[PDB]
Amino acid sequence: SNIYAPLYAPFFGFAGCAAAMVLSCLGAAIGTAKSGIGIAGIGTFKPELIMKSLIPVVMSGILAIYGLVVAVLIAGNLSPTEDYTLFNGFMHLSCGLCVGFACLSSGYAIGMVGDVGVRKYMHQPRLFVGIVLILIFSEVLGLYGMIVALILNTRGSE
Amino acid sequence: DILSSIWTEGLLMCLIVSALLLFILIVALSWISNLDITYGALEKSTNPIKK
Amino acid sequence: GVYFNIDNGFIEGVVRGYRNGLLSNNQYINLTQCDTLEDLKLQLSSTDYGNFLSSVSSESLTTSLIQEYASSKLYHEFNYIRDQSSGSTRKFMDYITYGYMIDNVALMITGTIHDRDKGEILQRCHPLGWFDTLPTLSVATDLESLYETVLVDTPLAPYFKNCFDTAEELDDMNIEIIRNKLYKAYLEDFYNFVTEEIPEPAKECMQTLLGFEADRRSINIALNSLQSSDIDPDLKSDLLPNIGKLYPLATFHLAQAQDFEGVRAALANVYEYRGFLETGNLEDHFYQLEMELCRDAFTQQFAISTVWAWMKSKEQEVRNITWIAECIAQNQRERINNYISVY
Amino acid sequence: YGIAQYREINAGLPTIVTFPFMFAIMFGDMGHGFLMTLAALSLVLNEKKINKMKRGEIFDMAFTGRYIILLMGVFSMYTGFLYNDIFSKTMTIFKSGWKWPDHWKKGESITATSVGTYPIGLDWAWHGTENALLFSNSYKMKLSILMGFIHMTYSYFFSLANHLYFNSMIDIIGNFIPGLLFMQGIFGYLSVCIVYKWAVDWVKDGKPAPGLLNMLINMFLSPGTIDDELYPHQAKVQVFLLLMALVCIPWLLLVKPLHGDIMIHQVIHTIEFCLNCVSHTASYLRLWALSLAHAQLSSVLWTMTIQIAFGFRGFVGVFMTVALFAMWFALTCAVLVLMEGTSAMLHSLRLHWVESMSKFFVGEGLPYEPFAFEYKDMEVA
Amino acid sequence: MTELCPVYAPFFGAIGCASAIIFTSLGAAYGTAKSGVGICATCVLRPDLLFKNIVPVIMAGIIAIYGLVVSVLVCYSLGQKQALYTGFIQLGAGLSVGLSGLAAGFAIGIVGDAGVRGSSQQPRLFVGMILILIFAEVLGLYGLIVALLLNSRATQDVV
Amino acid sequence: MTELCPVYAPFFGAIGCASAIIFTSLGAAYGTAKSGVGICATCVLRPDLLFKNIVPVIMAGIIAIYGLVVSVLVCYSLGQKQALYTGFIQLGAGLSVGLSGLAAGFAIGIVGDAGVRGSSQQPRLFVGMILILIFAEVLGLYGLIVALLLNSRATQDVV
Amino acid sequence: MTELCPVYAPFFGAIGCASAIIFTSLGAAYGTAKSGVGICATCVLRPDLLFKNIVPVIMAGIIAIYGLVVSVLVCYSLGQKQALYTGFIQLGAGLSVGLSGLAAGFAIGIVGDAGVRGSSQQPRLFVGMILILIFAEVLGLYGLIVALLLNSRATQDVV
Amino acid sequence: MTELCPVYAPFFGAIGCASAIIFTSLGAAYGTAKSGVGICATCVLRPDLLFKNIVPVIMAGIIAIYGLVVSVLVCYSLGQKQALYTGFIQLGAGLSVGLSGLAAGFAIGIVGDAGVRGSSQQPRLFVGMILILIFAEVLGLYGLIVALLLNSRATQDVV
Amino acid sequence: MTELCPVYAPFFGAIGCASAIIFTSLGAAYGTAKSGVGICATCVLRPDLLFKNIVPVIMAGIIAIYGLVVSVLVCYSLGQKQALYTGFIQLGAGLSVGLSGLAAGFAIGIVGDAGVRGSSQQPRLFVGMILILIFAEVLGLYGLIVALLLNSRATQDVV
Amino acid sequence: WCCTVLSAFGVVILSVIAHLFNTNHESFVGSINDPEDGPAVAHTVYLAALVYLVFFVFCGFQV
Amino acid sequence: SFSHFLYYLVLIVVIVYGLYKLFTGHGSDINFGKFLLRTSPYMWANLGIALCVGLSVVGAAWGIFITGSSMIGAGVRAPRITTKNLISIIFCEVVAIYGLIIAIVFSSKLTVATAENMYSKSNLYTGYSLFWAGITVGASNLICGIAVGITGATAAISDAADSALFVKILVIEIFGSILGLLGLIVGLLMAGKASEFQ
């Protein structure tokens, strides 16, 4: 057989896919949870700008789409029939770890800062610009990992 | 083909499954051992504002 | 915070519903235009308090009576929250009670230095700070008996053993020294407790709110301890909470602040207390800050400190109700709007 | 850091030049230094206008920094001439350096021939080579340590100048001569070691070439020089310097106290003197450290923030390289000059505050604030 | 599988590439979280310097860029026939940059929180905040220098 | 796969070269975090003392400088054919310098916080605080000297 | 490499030499940090007494001296074809000096800050402070002789 | 033992049949304990609701029913000859049903405590708590169905 | 011994018979501990209710009976020349009954404490407390049944 | 406002590296990895220099 | 803590064992790949199918009480919220529905391979695919259950305040449930392509 394609390489390919999806889901879930805690906290007091403050939950969703796209690509370039290579196996492994942990960290950061910012947004109206600035500057954190995932994956296929 | 004479693959499978069972058992024990009884409702206090 | 809802979830829901019952500024305005105390209760029945005060005749109604009855319903409900939960939250609510307990025991110290009466002293004890051995502690024939019965089978023991030595109490004034230093010991222990076993964010909110209360007690001590000079600064330094957020950089100067000039220089050093003592009465400023932090607590949704926030908020609310009732009963309508609550 | 002693040699005067050059030997690049020099000119040229306009948050402490930044910028120019890198990329005006063999295979590994010495700065032939990092790093380790030792000597002579101006002799004989002989006999002996090591063409000389920074740490063991002597008795006679230093340390410990707690203060004084000497001579590697950090950061940014050359001879490629260059210039300016330049500013600043100043500057005196003020148009409230 | 180029060589290089972004992302996440908590908590009293105090999150974004650049270049270093040694140095570079970035991110978070707390209360502390954030950034910068020098060394004279 | 030069030799070299920067970076980060909290606390109240008081953060950056120097020096001895002795020594040097720098960072941060607090009130504690920071830094200096000795013989007449 | 002098023999020596300086650095750093917190707390009231109460930090300095001297000597004891016995014994010496210095450092730190806190009030407690500091430093002293005497036999009549 | 019926295969059947009762029993024990605390706390003031408040306890008993039925119906398939395939199937069925029952028991316990607590104060929360129990028990029935399908599939076409 | 009856099956059998009594004893001991603490905290105010309040203790003793009966039943089957299947079945039965009894002990202790403290006030809470106890011990009943089923299966056509 | 300095630098520096490409200089072009076509990339980088010249003219609106 | 010291002991013993094998030269004797190949793929596939539904049920129940306890607590003050908030519980247990569906579609795949024959690429791929597809679906289901439970609790508290607040917070719950949908779709996509255990 092909020594560079041992039969346990798809194990690591599925490792990449599974880790990517689970960590991305976990990060998006933490972000959504903390942002929702903040939204519900300020709702009972100044119910009005709740829709304007919803945006961090939208970013948690965006993290979810990041995880989705990386995972679906990883799944797409796996199959039993094709001679999957072990290098490609650890490659999908690393792709998954990068994207998943980047999404998890970005979700933690965005959830915490979104919670605190939305709670303090009820007191001061113009804090929303800083809140959304922090929102996007934590967005870039997960975006960077997703780009890492894309390039590492496309070299795995190559 | 054998990994290690004493560490046969079947033993490794048994150890991995038993480790998963042991971990879930220990976490279940951690949940259930943190039961605490709401003793306040079960003791008629001497304070007048309750009685 | 997901483990919070394992057991406190019902407590959380009921306390949040209670927050929904808090009085807002608009219904404070509505209660303002009332002209008579019976009109006050008539309009207040429309509020969360409901028909609570339907058991008293209008002629027998007084501001003190409405104070007592509203505080009584609040105390019923706090006791209900206390005995409907267990564990770390149970100990937390015990610590909430413990401040009122300290005040009550300090009150009982009076009546033991001079034994004029016991039964009325025990009855007039406000019921929130009650513990089991209060009646036994009341029959004390001297300071010594109270000293031993308060070092065993009551939460008073750690503070007393930390602060007092074989009941050297007659030499020290109760209210200025015995009460306040005991309150300090309680406050240090409570801050410690929150720092080990509370989780975030209950921690990050309760620790700063407790620090605020420490700061308020410290500033009150500093201002009330300069009129007389028999409180030596070393005892004053001891008497100050020694934990909070203006400690130590402001606590030291307060300890050595000899006059109003010293306290103004020391307290204005910290940011969020600049001009705090310069204008008006400290009551309004301190209660306003307290209510702001409580509102801040309510913004958090999973946190143990929500019960502290709710019951401080309701206590300050009943204080506002008493203020309105008194400023309408005793006339002087120019000070109705002194109410502090923001909801 | 601290107001001067009543009449001592104010450390400001040497710092006027050393601080900009210590920064520059840390900074290196032509291009970043040139843009920051333009920024300095922005305040130098408009000094008349800015003097009567509120500093605020746009300039703030830079209000007085118009001339500091100018001088560190021109020294950045010099360090660029002598490190040969406009931003990261090396320039090639001067005479051709190493002549790698004229016949090369498609992908062969090619060494280079020392056909001569590049006259001004690091040889441009070193650029892009697999040994470039090692050569440059060894070079600028030695440069940093040598310049730092020279700075130590120049700063320590200020202690002698101060005591001589004050006409005190016991302090001289008890601190300067023992301290000077110690610091020279170890670290300046290391410096003379390294300069002799370059001076001799080692391979042609035939005798073994010692390691890049080896001889002194080899000597730490014993007077029995292990091997690879620098010169005839060069590794042998230095035992005299070592024994002189080790018999000097108790003299330094005892001379000053021999005019209750004076001895207790002076023992601490000797301990801190030696520990500061060794620690600061080691600390002088910071110049190297941020020089290399800046060089590598310039390389990486240049390699993947500018000049992909994608879409060559294409209008879409023109637009893409326009956007890429705008992003590159923004990144270089903000990140590079602000972050790293002020970082090197701070490192050299501390260097002068302790490594040089504390060797001689000890006295703290009263400040001079006379009675006058210009105007009160600040609208105080 | 060559004796010097085993089939499992890509493990170390790939894990280094992964860690190079994972650990720096965790560090930048902590830095951004603590910094922004301080921002929104203390500028609510006085808002106008929100844009001024945005800076520690910019520094955390620079840390994230640092991880991105090291990760993309070590990706560029990856291959199939690579020598075990190459995988070892790619792993070393990845861990170096990632953990140095994690330390830098902890520094960013703590320093930014304290700095914004001070700056909202007193203005001249802003410059000192800037200086410290620069230092907490040059920590991760040194990590990046080590990593890039390593993964440059990870390819020459390799059989 | 030589007996004295096994194929897995450079793994230890890479691990040491990285750890030399990770552990120093962690120490420096803790030091600068504690010192920065101290600086913010003292400067919100005493703004002018900021620039004068910046030194402890510099001495925290010392640990990062030391990590960088030892890491690059260890890296220059890396090689695909390097013997097991070389990897052993580079690993040992990296761990020694990194953990010495971590201890130095703990000391620097703790005493920097304490001394900043003290100098906030009393004026001439600054000199003593500086000398204590000097001893904390020279600790990392001993670590660096040990690392330099190991790296110096990392390739001394190695078979 | 012969089984008398296996290829992995220098691992124990390298890790021992590293751990010696590592553990003495941790001990000295803890001692100096905690005693320096004590100094910063005491000198705000008594600035003049700094030059006298400084001793425990210097004593931690001597602990670091012990660590470096043992580390450098046992490092000079290395070599590629070193006997397994040499590696084992030099690991023993390194760990011995390191952990003995760590214990001594804990003692120095706790005794020093407590003593300086006390001596802030009472002057005659200074001599007792110093006496206890020597009776704690003797721990690192014992570690010093133990490590040196292990090093003496590290290669004595070794094969 | 033959390859497809190895001697260690029945261990997984034994663990499956044990776990299928163990985990459901632990879940039902937690459920009945929490519900018992709740009902004893509420009945002391409201005895009239004691009889109807038992429902969560019957519900934990239903969890126990799940566990018992799956455990017996999986014990009915073990043997010293059973293949490794069947052993895995019964092991997996045991884990699925046991973990499902454990989660369901936790949910019943906590929800029953909260709901009995609510029903003490306000009447029509009783039906709400009952519905939450019903959903949390179709939850457990899902795991029951998974276990039955798995075990039923096991015994067919086995060598 | 034959691979189908390996010599190390008695290890599994001994562990199973051990666990079958150990875990049930742990659970019953904790249950009687909580019940006894509740009795000694309730009877102090209502002395005459003592003998009537000790029912949960009786049932914890019955859980101990379950452990004892499973242990005695298992020990009879155990033997040197047993097949590894018998060892696995004994181990599974022992763990099943032991952990089910431990769950029953958790439940019985918690509900007994709560119920006796409730019945200290509410005299008609004792019937509900008995009901909770019965539906909690049904867990131990099911553990007992699975233990009997497994152990009875353990020696059916065993080679 | 700030685009003036960017435009000026994109004239000067981009032009000097543009010509240094067109000079088929070793440090920039001819390597194994960089594009081999000197004048080809020189054309587009000269076009970038010209568009920055126009951009600088536009930014000269400070008067 | 004793547990942390146990982790330290495990780490040190595994590190020293690995170093011992590497130095004695049997670093290949710790062959992770050989362990993967020799263990039966049936074990991986079945552990995956078991754990997918198990973790789905765990997350479902976790979210169920997380929402329900606060829902009951808030319903005390105003029982108007009970029925109208039960939709949060419905969206919490649709996660369990997803787990059940993934479990049944996975149980469509198991079967007996021809003895030691077909112990090869197809069945190995199927085994690992089933294992970590089950882990993916189960863990994603668990975490979205946690998130939806927290958001449902917050929705209950908010509904106790105002009616329209509940409907504006229900979007948070919808966003949380999108995570569970994504977990289901990724599990299906990355599991389906593996054939049965031929």
Side-chain angles (χ1 to χ4, degrees), chain D residues 256-260 266-285:
Chain D
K256 280 177 74 44
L258 265 295
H259 56 283
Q266 174 60 18
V267 54
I268 303 304
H269 166 70
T270 65
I271 289 293
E272 61 89 31
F273 187 96
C274 294
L275 290 185
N276 296 295
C277 171
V278 290
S279 64
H280 292 323
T281 318
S283 177
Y284 291 161
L285 276 298

Coordinates of all heavy atoms in Angstrom, one line a residue, chain D residues 256-285, unseen atoms left out:
Chain D
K256 N 36.5 52.8 52.3 CA 35.6 53.9 52.7 C 35.2 53.9 54.2 O 35.3 55.0 54.8 CB 34.3 53.9 51.8 CG 34.6 54.5 50.4 CD 33.3 54.3 49.5 CE 32.3 55.3 49.9 NZ 32.8 56.7 50.2
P257 N 34.8 52.8 54.8 CA 34.5 52.9 56.2 C 35.6 53.4 57.1 O 35.4 54.0 58.2 CB 34.1 51.5 56.6 CG 33.7 50.8 55.3 CD 34.6 51.5 54.3
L258 N 36.9 53.2 56.7 CA 38.0 53.6 57.5 C 38.3 55.1 57.3 O 39.2 55.5 56.6 CB 39.2 52.8 57.2 CG 39.5 51.5 58.0 CD1 39.8 51.9 59.5 CD2 38.3 50.6 58.0
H259 N 37.4 55.9 58.0 CA 37.6 57.3 57.9 C 38.9 57.8 58.6 O 39.3 57.2 59.6 CB 36.4 58.0 58.6 CG 36.2 57.5 60.0 ND1 35.6 56.3 60.4 CD2 36.4 58.1 61.2 CE1 35.5 56.1 61.7 NE2 36.0 57.2 62.2
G260 N 28.8 54.6 63.1 CA 28.4 53.3 63.5 C 27.8 52.5 62.4 O 28.2 51.3 62.2
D261 N 26.9 53.0 61.6 CA 26.2 52.4 60.5 C 26.9 52.7 59.2 O 26.4 52.3 58.1 CB 24.8 52.8 60.4
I262 N 28.0 53.4 59.2 CA 28.7 53.7 58.0 C 29.2 52.5 57.3 O 29.1 52.3 56.0 CB 29.9 54.7 58.2
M263 N 29.8 51.5 58.0 CA 30.2 50.3 57.5 C 29.0 49.5 56.9 O 29.1 48.8 55.9 CB 30.9 49.4 58.5
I264 N 27.9 49.5 57.6 CA 26.7 48.8 57.2 C 26.2 49.4 55.9 O 25.7 48.6 55.0 CB 25.6 48.8 58.3
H265 N 26.3 50.7 55.7 CA 25.9 51.3 54.4 C 26.9 50.9 53.3 O 26.5 50.6 52.2 CB 25.8 52.8 54.6
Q266 N 28.2 51.0 53.7 CA 29.2 50.8 52.6 C 29.3 49.4 52.1 O 29.6 49.1 50.9 CB 30.6 51.2 53.2 CG 31.7 51.0 52.2 CD 31.6 51.6 50.9 OE1 30.8 52.6 50.7 NE2 32.3 51.2 49.9
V267 N 29.0 48.4 53.0 CA 29.0 47.0 52.5 C 27.9 46.8 51.5 O 28.1 46.2 50.4 CB 28.9 46.0 53.7 CG1 27.7 46.3 54.5 CG2 28.8 44.6 53.1
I268 N 26.7 47.4 51.8 CA 25.6 47.3 50.8 C 26.0 48.1 49.5 O 25.7 47.7 48.4 CB 24.3 47.9 51.4 CG1 24.0 47.2 52.7 CG2 23.2 47.9 50.4 CD1 23.8 45.7 52.5
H269 N 26.8 49.2 49.7 CA 27.2 49.9 48.5 C 28.1 49.1 47.6 O 27.9 49.1 46.4 CB 28.0 51.2 49.0 CG 28.8 51.9 47.9 ND1 28.2 52.5 46.9 CD2 30.1 52.0 47.7 CE1 29.1 53.0 46.1 NE2 30.3 52.7 46.6
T270 N 29.1 48.4 48.2 CA 29.9 47.5 47.4 C 29.1 46.4 46.7 O 29.3 46.1 45.5 CB 31.1 46.9 48.2 OG1 30.5 46.1 49.2 CG2 31.8 48.0 48.9
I271 N 28.2 45.8 47.5 CA 27.4 44.7 46.9 C 26.6 45.2 45.7 O 26.7 44.6 44.6 CB 26.5 44.1 48.0 CG1 27.3 43.3 49.0 CG2 25.5 43.2 47.4 CD1 28.0 42.1 48.5
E272 N 25.9 46.3 45.9 CA 25.1 46.8 44.8 C 26.0 47.3 43.6 O 25.7 47.1 42.5 CB 24.2 48.0 45.2 CG 24.9 49.2 45.8 CD 25.3 50.2 44.8 OE1 24.5 50.3 43.8 OE2 26.3 50.9 45.0
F273 N 27.2 47.8 43.9 CA 28.1 48.3 42.9 C 28.4 47.1 42.0 O 28.3 47.2 40.7 CB 29.4 48.9 43.5 CG 30.3 49.5 42.4 CD1 30.2 50.8 42.2 CD2 31.2 48.7 41.7 CE1 31.1 51.4 41.2 CE2 32.0 49.3 40.8 CZ 31.9 50.6 40.5
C274 N 28.9 46.0 42.5 CA 29.3 44.8 41.7 C 28.1 44.3 41.0 O 28.1 43.9 39.8 CB 29.9 43.8 42.6 SG 31.5 44.3 43.2
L275 N 26.9 44.1 41.7 CA 25.8 43.5 41.1 C 25.2 44.4 39.9 O 24.9 43.9 38.9 CB 24.7 43.2 42.1 CG 25.2 42.1 43.0 CD1 24.1 41.7 44.0 CD2 25.6 40.9 42.2
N276 N 25.2 45.7 40.1 CA 24.8 46.6 39.1 C 25.8 46.5 37.9 O 25.4 46.5 36.7 CB 24.6 48.1 39.5 CG 23.5 48.2 40.5 OD1 22.4 48.1 40.2 ND2 23.9 48.6 41.8
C277 N 27.1 46.4 38.2 CA 28.0 46.4 37.1 C 27.8 45.2 36.2 O 27.6 45.3 35.0 CB 29.5 46.3 37.7 SG 30.7 45.9 36.5
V278 N 27.7 44.0 36.8 CA 27.5 42.8 36.0 C 26.1 42.8 35.3 O 26.0 42.6 34.1 CB 27.6 41.5 36.8 CG1 29.1 41.3 37.2 CG2 26.8 41.5 38.1
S279 N 25.0 43.2 36.1 CA 23.7 43.2 35.5 C 23.6 44.2 34.4 O 22.9 43.9 33.3 CB 22.7 43.5 36.6 OG 22.9 44.8 37.1
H280 N 24.2 45.3 34.5 CA 24.0 46.4 33.5 C 24.9 46.0 32.2 O 24.4 46.3 31.1 CB 24.4 47.7 34.0 CG 23.5 48.2 35.1 ND1 22.1 48.1 35.0 CD2 23.7 48.9 36.2 CE1 21.6 48.6 36.1 NE2 22.5 49.1 36.8
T281 N 26.1 45.5 32.4 CA 26.8 45.1 31.3 C 26.1 44.0 30.5 O 26.2 43.9 29.3 CB 28.2 44.6 31.7 OG1 28.7 45.5 32.7 CG2 29.1 44.6 30.5
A282 N 25.4 43.1 31.2 CA 24.5 42.2 30.5 C 23.3 42.9 29.9 O 22.9 42.5 28.8 CB 24.0 41.1 31.5
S283 N 22.8 43.9 30.5 CA 21.6 44.5 30.0 C 21.9 45.2 28.7 O 21.0 45.4 27.9 CB 21.1 45.5 31.1 OG 20.0 46.3 30.6
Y284 N 23.1 45.6 28.5 CA 23.5 46.3 27.2 C 23.2 45.4 26.0 O 23.3 45.9 24.8 CB 24.9 46.7 27.2 CG 25.2 47.8 28.2 CD1 26.4 48.1 28.7 CD2 24.1 48.6 28.6 CE1 26.6 49.1 29.5 CE2 24.3 49.6 29.5 CZ 25.6 49.9 29.9 OH 25.8 50.9 30.8
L285 N 22.7 44.2 26.2 CA 22.3 43.3 25.0 C 21.0 43.8 24.5 O 20.6 43.3 23.4 CB 22.3 41.9 25.5 CG 23.6 41.1 25.4 CD1 24.1 41.0 24.0 CD2 24.7 41.6 26.3

